[PDB]
Each structure stands twice: as structure tokens, then as C-alpha cells.
């Protein structure tokens, strides 16, 4: 838990269009801010700045069962980070996250799948952005 932002972070989250829409980017922030360790702040009040933005949001068919039906999902994407630090300087750059799941065969992904899956992936996804920035 050592880091090098300061203690007040505004963090951004931004979502892809879609539409199978489900909330999540309030999650994002609320994870992102809890890794990282300091406390949440409005814009024009924050030190640091980093803006998350997910991307390539994608349902990967990981296996089949015997009649060729999806049974296994690998969920993956990637967080686009725009950091400006309180000195000025700027960091842009991407990290990965993916998550397996199974499902049962011809049924269609639950929102409730959908959720834990972009949230478990973006959660992999910031422990790298973590490190890093270490």
C-alpha cells in the first residue's frame, strides 16, 4: 500500500457507448479510490487527477459443450488512464483485466454476470495500474 499520489485524488470514470448497459462506473471509481489508498475530492478541489476510461469491452467463448452452445465466457477489457499530478505533469497509458465465468448453455449473460465480470476484470486491471505507478 505504498504510493505516490497525493492525499486528495479526483477520479473520472467514463464508459464506452453500448447498448446490455449496465452501471458499473461509480464502482470503478469507488475501487479505484479505495486501492489507491487516499480520499476521494471534487476537481477544482483535488491534487492529482485521473480520468479511467474502459475500453474494448469484450466477451471472449472460452469452451462448448457438446452441442456447440457457449458454456464458458472470458470477459475482458482494458482501463485508459489520463493522470495529471499536482506538479503538472501527464501519464497516459493502458492496462488489461479478464475474468472467466460460466454460464449455462444458450442463456443469455445476466446483468448481474455482466457486472461482476467488468468489475472483476477492471479490478485486475487497476492493481497493475498500481504498480505501475510504484
Not at 497516459?92 to 457486472?115: H, M, V
Request: proline residues 1%; negative net charge.
Amino acid at each position: 500500500a505504498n504510493n505516490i499520489f497525493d492525499e486528495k485524488v479526483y477520479v473520472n470514470v467514463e464508459l464506452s457507448q453500448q447498448d446490455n448497459s449496465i452501471y458499473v462506473a461509480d464502482t470503478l471509481k469507488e475501487m479505484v479510490i479505495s486501492k489507491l489508498g487516499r480520499k476521494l475530492a471534487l476537481k477544482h478541489e483535488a491534487d492529482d487527477v485521473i480520468n479511467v476510461k474502459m475500453n474494448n469491452l469484450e466477451f471472449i467463448p472460452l469452451a462448448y459443450d457438446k452441442n456447440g452452445y457457449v458454456i464458458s465466457y472470458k470477459a475482458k477489457l482494458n482501463l485508459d488512464f489520463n493522470v495529471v499530478f499536482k506538479d503538472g505533469s501527464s501519464q497516459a497509458f493502458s492496462t488489461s483485466g479478464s475474468y472467466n465465468f460460466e454460464i449455462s448453455p444458450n442463456s443469455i449473460i445476466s446483468d448481474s454476470a455482466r457486472y461482476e465480470a467488468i468489475r472483476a476484470a477492471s479490478s485486475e486491471a487497476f492493481d497493475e495500474f498500481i504498480s505501475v505507478i510504484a
